[PDB]
Design an enzyme around this catalytic site. Structure first.
Site, PDB file in Angstrom:
ATOM      1  N   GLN A 245       0.861  -1.262  -0.042  1.00 21.59           N
ATOM      2  CA  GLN A 245      -0.159   0.114   0.034  1.00 21.59           C
ATOM      3  C   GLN A 245       0.772   1.278  -0.029  1.00 21.59           C
ATOM      4  O   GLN A 245       0.871   1.885  -1.051  1.00 21.59           O
ATOM      5  CB  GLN A 245      -1.028  -0.041   1.076  1.00 21.59           C
ATOM      6  CG  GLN A 245      -1.822  -1.277   1.382  1.00 21.59           C
ATOM      7  CD  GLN A 245      -3.145  -1.130   1.966  1.00 21.59           C
ATOM      8  OE1 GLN A 245      -3.761  -0.132   1.589  1.00 21.59           O
ATOM      9  NE2 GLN A 245      -3.482  -2.017   2.963  1.00 21.59           N
TER      10      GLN A 245
ATOM     11  N   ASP B  13       0.894  -0.804   8.469  1.00 24.19           N
ATOM     12  CA  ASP B  13      -0.535  -0.180   9.192  1.00 24.19           C
ATOM     13  C   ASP B  13      -0.661   1.301   9.192  1.00 24.19           C
ATOM     14  O   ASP B  13      -0.336   1.737   7.950  1.00 24.19           O
ATOM     15  CB  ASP B  13      -0.567  -0.750  10.686  1.00 24.19           C
ATOM     16  CG  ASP B  13      -0.526  -2.526  10.554  1.00 24.19           C
ATOM     17  OD1 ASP B  13      -1.297  -3.276   9.654  1.00 24.19           O
ATOM     18  OD2 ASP B  13       0.099  -2.769  11.630  1.00 24.19           O
TER      19      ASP B  13
ATOM     20  N   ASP C 216      -5.136 -14.642   4.789  1.00 27.63           N
ATOM     21  CA  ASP C 216      -5.469 -14.163   6.211  1.00 27.63           C
ATOM     22  C   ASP C 216      -6.598 -13.268   5.992  1.00 27.63           C
ATOM     23  O   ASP C 216      -6.789 -12.495   5.224  1.00 27.63           O
ATOM     24  CB  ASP C 216      -4.143 -13.451   6.786  1.00 27.63           C
ATOM     25  CG  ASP C 216      -3.751 -12.090   6.081  1.00 27.63           C
ATOM     26  OD1 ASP C 216      -3.418 -12.248   5.033  1.00 27.63           O
ATOM     27  OD2 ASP C 216      -3.799 -10.845   6.902  1.00 27.63           O
ATOM     28  N   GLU C 217      -7.364 -13.500   7.024  1.00 28.47           N
ATOM     29  CA  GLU C 217      -8.369 -12.265   7.239  1.00 28.47           C
ATOM     30  C   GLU C 217      -9.525 -12.042   6.276  1.00 28.47           C
ATOM     31  O   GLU C 217      -9.846 -10.741   6.150  1.00 28.47           O
ATOM     32  CB  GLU C 217      -7.812 -11.069   7.688  1.00 28.47           C
ATOM     33  CG  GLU C 217      -7.020 -11.212   9.077  1.00 28.47           C
ATOM     34  CD  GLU C 217      -6.244 -10.063   9.482  1.00 28.47           C
ATOM     35  OE1 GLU C 217      -5.739  -9.105   8.793  1.00 28.47           O
ATOM     36  OE2 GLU C 217      -5.868 -10.174  10.774  1.00 28.47           O
TER      37      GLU C 217
ATOM     38  N   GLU D 120       5.566  -8.769   0.435  1.00 29.82           N
ATOM     39  CA  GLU D 120       4.061  -8.362   0.038  1.00 29.82           C
ATOM     40  C   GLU D 120       4.352  -7.161  -0.368  1.00 29.82           C
ATOM     41  O   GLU D 120       4.661  -6.191   0.023  1.00 29.82           O
ATOM     42  CB  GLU D 120       3.235  -8.154   1.227  1.00 29.82           C
ATOM     43  CG  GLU D 120       1.759  -8.138   0.690  1.00 29.82           C
ATOM     44  CD  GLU D 120       0.883  -8.025   1.708  1.00 29.82           C
ATOM     45  OE1 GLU D 120      -0.302  -7.822   1.448  1.00 29.82           O
ATOM     46  OE2 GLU D 120       0.950  -8.355   2.993  1.00 29.82           O
TER      47      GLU D 120
HETATM   48  C1  LIG Z   1      -0.857 -12.094   8.852  1.00 31.44           C
HETATM   49  C2  LIG Z   1      -1.166 -10.969   9.577  1.00 31.44           C
HETATM   50  O1  LIG Z   1      -0.645 -10.418  10.464  1.00 31.44           O
HETATM   51  N1  LIG Z   1      -2.340 -10.061   8.983  1.00 31.44           N
HETATM   52  C3  LIG Z   1      -2.552  -8.899   9.639  1.00 31.44           C
HETATM   53  C4  LIG Z   1      -2.592  -8.556  11.033  1.00 31.44           C
HETATM   54  N2  LIG Z   1      -3.510  -9.158  11.803  1.00 31.44           N
HETATM   55  O2  LIG Z   1      -3.370  -8.912  13.366  1.00 31.44           O
HETATM   56  O3  LIG Z   1      -1.379  -8.042  11.831  1.00 31.44           O
HETATM   57  C5  LIG Z   1      -0.471  -7.300  11.112  1.00 31.44           C
HETATM   58  C6  LIG Z   1       0.121  -6.153  12.042  1.00 31.44           C
HETATM   59  O4  LIG Z   1      -0.887  -5.358  12.505  1.00 31.44           O
HETATM   60  C7  LIG Z   1      -1.141  -6.567   9.786  1.00 31.44           C
HETATM   61  O5  LIG Z   1      -0.624  -5.470   9.054  1.00 31.44           O
HETATM   62  C8  LIG Z   1      -1.427  -7.647   8.817  1.00 31.44           C
HETATM   63  O6  LIG Z   1      -2.283  -7.422   7.846  1.00 31.44           O
HETATM   64  C9  LIG Z   1      -1.830  -6.941   6.712  1.00 31.44           C
HETATM   65  O7  LIG Z   1      -2.013  -5.614   6.729  1.00 31.44           O
HETATM   66  C10 LIG Z   1      -0.954  -4.948   5.437  1.00 31.44           C
HETATM   67  C11 LIG Z   1      -1.005  -3.383   5.626  1.00 31.44           C
HETATM   68  O8  LIG Z   1      -0.193  -3.079   6.970  1.00 31.44           O
HETATM   69  C12 LIG Z   1      -1.470  -5.648   4.309  1.00 31.44           C
HETATM   70  O9  LIG Z   1      -2.975  -4.916   3.706  1.00 31.44           O
HETATM   71  C13 LIG Z   1      -1.595  -7.203   3.985  1.00 31.44           C
HETATM   72  O10 LIG Z   1      -2.410  -7.767   3.099  1.00 31.44           O
HETATM   73  C14 LIG Z   1      -2.534  -7.626   5.429  1.00 31.44           C
HETATM   74  O11 LIG Z   1      -1.892  -8.917   5.426  1.00 31.44           O
END
Ligand SMILES: CC(=O)N[C@H]1/C(=N/O)O[C@H](CO)[C@@H](O)[C@@H]1O[C@@H]1O[C@H](CO)[C@H](O)[C@H](O)[C@H]1O
EC number: 3.2.1.140
Length: 636
Positions: free
Chosen positions: A163, A440, A293-294, A189
């Site tokens: 991002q 983040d 994830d998620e 990523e």
């Molecule tokens: C695998 C993972 O940790 N997923 C997210 C998470 N869940 O608690 O924690 C971290 C830390 O805060 C996140 O950053 C992880 O998400 C990811 O965010 C980034 C942007 O920061 C991006 O979109 C990525 O696809 C996503 O997995």
């Protein structure tokens, strides 16, 4: 009474049968455990060479040049016979039992300092210890021998260059630091700029060009680092689907999420596969990481009945949305296997299934300990990597700051999975472990501040994945040695701030002010630029954002009341005004300067009106005014 008579010892170059019994052995990270002490010591000095075969010439030349810088002694590479004054590099592929693919041996004695590896990377890794031992102000090394190899095969970091953009200069430094630390794994990523007409609307910033990726992959590979791409799917897809609503998953009321791929839509799945094929050309790795994830974060599969319908059609009566989800993973596995790759996912992709079962040939990178527990996955025979949250950093989520002291002192090891859930650290399908570096909300910390913060934790993971030992009685003893060791040469050489603070004419900024401009440096290696006309400071503050950072191609900078750029990242309440006022200045090859917003890593340029990007289809800055653009659009 006379003085102390204190004078430099000044030992002769090469081997000495005499040495004091408790002469310090300079520390390394990873530690080299089980050193056997020999008699005497070896001194790097005038006339010392790095000697090798022709095949190892590049390695030797690189080490000689590096050591000349660290030591102030003129160290040259050579071939042929080695003397006791010399460092020798030997590749002996017959030693795989003893050393494996990445291990090495040091023999320090009357023949000089020998480095032996069974592979080119093994020799290179031995040279990293030589560099660490000789760059701490001591040029005499106790004689003896040691052989070391890493306990785990994969040792490294997740770097979410996602991002937001992490500068390619930052990535190069990061790779140099990983190499120093004998870390061989980076999950990157990131967006590779999509160029073909089924994918090109997703060429929004951040992106990396093909040429840029090829360059850092080549650097990585010379350092023994496997750069694995990730395109997270079917969730966390906003940066790919924002311009493709036709591929977004709608909930029962018809509301689409740009983060969710519609895995029931075969054109959406083809879009994802098209991305994989675009990445194939520039990464060399044998792995693909699809995330997983998620997907349903902030919601539930109950809200997406169309996935239940799809599941029943595709995988038979009784199939569930979890089945459709797992079927998409298995379909991607089939796809990437056919290209010669092994799939990897995050563990929260392991869901409760009925009609479909997850393929066991997928590497599971375990970060979320509320799912299926670690010991359960061991029982099932999955291949696991430890990606614990204990090893996360986030710019914004203060829950995620690695505490190396705590982990060192509490006996964490690579078998200590998320939530302090232990598995057998000798599990024969435990690949290793990694720290994870997440942006983040991204204005709280500059990438240079991230670099400063991760230092200790990167040393911690290096130690625990290679040596799996705690030879320092406490973390504080480790810390003192890691600081003496310091960064590798490339980091020490990087010109963070290439121009002096002062007053400057900057013609590129005339659309903002005629200037001149007062530049001052910041602790994190950036500048603040004050307009002497208005008394305000230049900021990149306004435009469309991802992760609260301006990502908009063609966003224009503006003058704002001067923020205090001298303070640290603990001043969170002023972070956005502060960091939007920081500028990175770089010199060309050769000598012209570029100005980049520190947080965005786009480049200021005068808009011609001919730059081509999807953002500029729907808003362009006025032609001839100064705006930010990705470097590839302004490389004219
Ligand atoms: C695998 C993972 O940790 N997923 C997210 C998470 N869940 O608690 O924690 C971290 C830390 O805060 C996140 O950053 C992880 O998400 C990811 O965010 C980034 C942007 O920061 C991006 O979109 C990525 O696809 C996503 O997995």
């Amino acid at each position: 009474h006379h003085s102390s008579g204190l004078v430099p010892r000044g030992s002769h170059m090469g081997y000495s049968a005499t040495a004091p019994v408790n002469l310090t052995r300079p520390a390394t990270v990873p530690s080299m455990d089980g050193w056997t002490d020999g008699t005497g010591a070896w001194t790097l000095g005038e006339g010392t060479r790095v000697v090798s075969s022709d095949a190892l010439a590049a390695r030797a030349q690189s080490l000689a040049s590096e050591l000349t810088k660290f030591t102030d002694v003129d160290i040259k590479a050579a071939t042929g016979s080695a003397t006791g004054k010399d460092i020798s590099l030997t590749l002996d592929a017959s030693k795989k039992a003893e050393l494996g693919d990445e291990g090495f041996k040091l023999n320090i004695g009357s023949k000089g300092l020998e480095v032996i590896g069974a592979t080119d990377i093994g020799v290179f890794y031995g040279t990293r210890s030589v560099s660490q031992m000789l760059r701490q102000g001591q040029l005499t090394l106790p004689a003896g021998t040691v052989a070391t190899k890493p306990k785990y095969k994969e040792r490294g970091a997740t770097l979410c260059a996602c991002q937001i953009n992490i500068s390619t200069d930052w990535i190069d430094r990061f790779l140099s630091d990983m190499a120093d630390l004998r870390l061989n794994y980076v999950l990157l990523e990131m967006k590779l700029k999509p160029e073909e007409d089924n994918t090109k609307k997703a060429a929004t910033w951040s992106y990396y060009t093909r040429d840029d990726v090829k360059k850092f992959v080549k650097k990585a590979n010379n350092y023994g680092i496997d750069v694995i791409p990730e395109i997270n799917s079917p969730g966390h897809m906003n940066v790919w689907l924002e311009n493709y609503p036709e591929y977004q998953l709608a909930d029962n009321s018809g509301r689409k999420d740009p983060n969710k791929l519609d895995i029931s839509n075969p054109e959406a799945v083809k879009f994802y596969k098209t991305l994989i094929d675009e990445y194939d050309g520039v990464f060399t790795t044998k792995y693909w990481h699809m995330g997983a994830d998620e997907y349903m974060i902030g919601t539930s599969f109950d809200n997406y009945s169309k996935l239940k319908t799809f599941a029943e059609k595709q995988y038979g009566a009784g199939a569930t949305p979890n089945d459709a989800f797992t079927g998409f993973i298995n379909d991607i596995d089939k796809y990437v296997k056919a290209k010669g790759k092994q799939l990897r996912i995050w563990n929260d992709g392991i869901v409760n299934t009925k009609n479909v079962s997850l393929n066991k040939d997928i590497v599971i990178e375990y970060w979320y300990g509320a799912g299926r527990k670690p010991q359960e996955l061991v029982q099932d025979g999955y291949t696991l990597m430890n990606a614990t949250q204990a090893l996360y950093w986030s710019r914004s989520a203060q829950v995620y700051k690695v505490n190396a002291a705590r982990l060192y002192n509490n006996n964490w090891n690579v078998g200590t999975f998320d939530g302090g859930r232990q598995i057998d650290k000798n599990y024969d399908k435990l690949t290793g472990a990694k720290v994870s570096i997440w942006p983040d909300s991204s204005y709280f910390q500059t990438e240079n501040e991230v670099e400063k913060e991760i230092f200790d934790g990167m040393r911690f993971i290096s130690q625990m994945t290679w040596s799996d030992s705690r030879p320092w009685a406490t973390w504080n003893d480790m810390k003192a040695d890691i600081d003496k060791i310091g960064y590798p040469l490339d980091i020490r050489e990087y010109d963070y701030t290439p121009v002096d603070a002062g007053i400057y004419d900057i013609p590129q900024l005339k659309s903002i002010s005629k200037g001149p401009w007062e530049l001052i440096t910041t602790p994190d290696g950036y500048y603040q630029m004050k307009d002497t006309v208005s008394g305000k400071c230049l900021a990149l503050f306004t435009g469309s954002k991802h992760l609260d950072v301006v990502t908009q191609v063609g966003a224009r900078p503006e003058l704002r009341n001067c923020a205090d750029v001298s303070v640290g990242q603990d001043q969170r309440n002023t972070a956005n005004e502060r960091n939007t006022q920081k500028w990175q200045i770089r010199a060309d090859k050769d000598g012209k300067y570029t100005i980049s917003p520190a947080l965005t890593q786009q480049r200021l340029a005068i808009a011609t009106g001919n730059e081509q990007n999807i953002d500029l289809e729907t808003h362009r800055p006025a032609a001839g005014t100064v705006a930010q653009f990705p470097a590839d659009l302004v490389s004219d």
